[PDB]
Write a protein that binds this ligand. Structure first.
Ligand SMILES: [Mg+2]
Ligand SMILES: [Mg+2]
Ligand SMILES: [Mg+2]
Lengths: 236, 378
């Protein structure tokens, strides 16, 4: 399938087992997320509070990130609007950490035994990440995800790793244009852009990755030619 | 004659490749892989292909490639039979060509305002996407000047060459330069299409580019349930599956309505579509659904566009069909948007002979619903 999440499932089955809510609560949560729309969001959010206790919220963040967000990129705005409406800043943090966790499972997974879908899962999680951090004026701390080093490590590893990582980075950075704090010419954003602009100068980078970078620039209203590529790759 | 498995191999303009990349078209599909280089050589093409916009990529790409953007003339035309298909094809064409810097695309149909289209054609249009009646009218009024049209696409030619439009089509062709490249796409080839072929196409390259409907990829279940318990069974399914968007098929327009009303009250997100609705309204509902404004669509077998909705990952047969062909139309996919993950059949005891007959006729397997979903009905 194109929505195989086994790679995430397996990695979870080797983590500290958390408290699973009773089936009637699980079922209610699935029903809510299955039937969530813009025109019932208020009603659905209220239902969510009136049914899920505080101790189940870790499970709910795991459900939302692993089972929904990773394979429903078309409803990212909806779940994000859902979080805004829920006004549960401690729930948001669980979702953030679960997002970082699954991202790392993918980034560090053996790319040879990977499912066809794993690239998509990574892109989707990156898109979501950008939406719940940058777009909402929260930083992506390097102690959670160091984007610049990710790019540099990928370039050392080869085309296969770049093929996974570059579209991941682009999906994340897409959200920066919606952030008063992180939009260009924000220094953190531009340092990543400058590394990407340097990759873009590599003659043998696959054309579709060159397009990822050029399209990222267009989305951030950046002139690709106005970027300031360094010499970080020239060591490698 | 495939130039390779990558878009890059076809020597297209870089700007055009970017548009293709942004569409999410990573590699050329088989219909593209064959259609494109022949079209780029200038050959007429006669192609068998399924109805709808799935194949628009196969002709829009060489069409856009052949445009000369320094010329302020209509250079290419796409004729389609309905206003809906014209809007869809033009939207795709605009997105595909968004990096080309100045490609002017215009859709003109009975749905769009004549006066306003006239005004629009005062300015540069390179590509016209139109219904037959409207474009013939503009050509005849001297508003659409077509003496530079070097390529015309007939999309769904069987419908374009039926009794309603065949003479209008004839009139159009005769206004075009005699050497114009013609690319014809059609699901069927009745006598009308054959006649047009012999009269107008210059030794066409003929390809069957139809992706047949397969059940491969779809996990299919059935659950025995009385009519009394179907909605409850439905509630279980929506509490146990991961549903991005779903389509729920019923066997009549009346039952679609009653079901939609019932589940709307149960907190479901849904719209419904059936036969006793004006087409404009059907189109509005389909647009909303494809745009994610609701999660589930309840409908009859009259809705054939579920195929064009990428997020649909689950189909429910609330009522089991009587015919294998009907079942295959509901659940089968071509693989371009991939395959559905999951199909679930709610069957009464009296549906069993049909279930078994259809499974066998389709050479497929429809398994019983797994235990951990079957519990919680109780
Ligand atoms: Mg029409
Ligand atoms: Mg129409
Ligand atoms: Mg019309």
């Amino acid at each position: 399938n194109t929505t195989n999440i086994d790679t995430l499932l397996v990695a979870t089955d080797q983590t500290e087992r958390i408290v699973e809510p009773p089936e009637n609560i699980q079922e209610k949560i699935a029903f809510i997320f299955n039937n969530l729309s813009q025109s019932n969001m208020t009603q659905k959010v209220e239902e969510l509070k009136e049914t899920v206790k505080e101790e189940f919220m870790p499970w709910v963040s795991q459900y939302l990130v692993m089972k929904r967000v990773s394979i429903e990129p078309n409803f990212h705005s909806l779940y994000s609007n859902f979080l805004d409406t829920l006004k549960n800043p401690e729930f948001n943090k669980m979702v953030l950490n679960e997002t970082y966790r699954n991202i790392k499972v993918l980034l560090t997974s053996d790319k040879a035994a990977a499912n066809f879908s794993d690239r998509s899962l990574l892109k989707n999680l990156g898109h979501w990440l950008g939406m719940i951090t940058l777009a909402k004026n929260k930083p992506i701390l390097h102690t959670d995800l160091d984007v610049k080093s990710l790019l540099l490590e990928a370039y050392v590893k080869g085309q296969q790793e770049l093929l996974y990582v570059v579209p991941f980075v682009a999906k994340v950075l897409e959200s920066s244009i919606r952030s008063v704090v992180f939009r260009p010419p924000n220094p953190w954003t531009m340092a990543i852009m400058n590394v990407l602009a340097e990759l873009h100068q590599e003659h043998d980078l696959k054309l579709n990755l060159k397009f990822e970078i050029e399209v990222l620039c267009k989305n951030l209203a950046l002139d690709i030619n106005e970027l300031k590529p360094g010499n970080l790759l020239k060591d490698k | 004659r495939s130039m390779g498995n990558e878009f890059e191999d076809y020597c297209l303009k870089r700007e055009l490749l970017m548009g293709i990349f942004e569409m999410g078209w990573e590699k050329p599909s088989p219909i593209q892989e064959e259609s494109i280089p022949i079209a780029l050589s200038g050959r007429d093409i006669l192609a068998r292909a399924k109805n709808g916009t799935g194949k628009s990529g196969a002709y829009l790409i060489p069409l856009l490639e052949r445009l000369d953007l320094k010329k302020d003339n209509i250079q290419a035309m796409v004729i389609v039979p309905t206003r809906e298909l014209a809007l869809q094809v033009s939207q795709i064409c605009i997105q595909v060509s968004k990096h080309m810097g100045g490609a002017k695309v215009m859709a003109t149909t009975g749905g769009t305002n004549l006066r306003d289209d006239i005004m629009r054609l005062d300015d540069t249009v390179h590509v016209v996407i139109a219904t037959p009646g409207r474009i013939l009218d503009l050509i005849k009024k001297g508003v659409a000047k077509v003496d530079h049209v070097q390529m015309i696409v007939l999309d769904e030619a069987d419908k374009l060459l039926s009794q309603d439009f065949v003479q209008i089509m004839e009139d159009i062709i005769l206004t075009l330069p005699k050497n114009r490249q013609i690319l014809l796409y059609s699901a069927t080839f009745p006598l009308s299409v054959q006649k047009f072929m012999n009269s107008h196409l210059q030794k066409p390259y003929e390809i069957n580019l139809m992706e047949e409907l397969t059940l491969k990829g779809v996990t299919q279940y059935y659950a025995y349930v009385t009519e009394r318990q179907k909605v409850h069974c439905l509630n279980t399914l929506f509490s146990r599956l991961q549903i991005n968007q779903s389509i729920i098929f019923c066997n009549s327009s009346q039952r679609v309505e009653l079901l939609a009303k019932k589940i709307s009250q149960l907190g479901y997100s849904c719209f419904y579509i059936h036969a006793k609705m004006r087409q404009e309204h059907r189109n509005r509902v389909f647009h909303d659904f494809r745009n994610g404004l609701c999660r589930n669509l309840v409908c009859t077998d009259l809705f054939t566009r579920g195929i064009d909705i990428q997020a649909v990952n689950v189909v429910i047969n609330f009522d089991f069909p009587k015919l294998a062909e009907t079942y295959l139309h509901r659940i089968g996919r071509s693989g371009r948007f991939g395959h559905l993950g999951l199909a679930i059949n709610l069957i009464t005891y009296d549906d069993r002979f049909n279930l078994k007959s259809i499974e066998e006729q389709l050479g497929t397997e429809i398994k019983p619903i797994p235990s951990n979903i079957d519990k919680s009905l109780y």
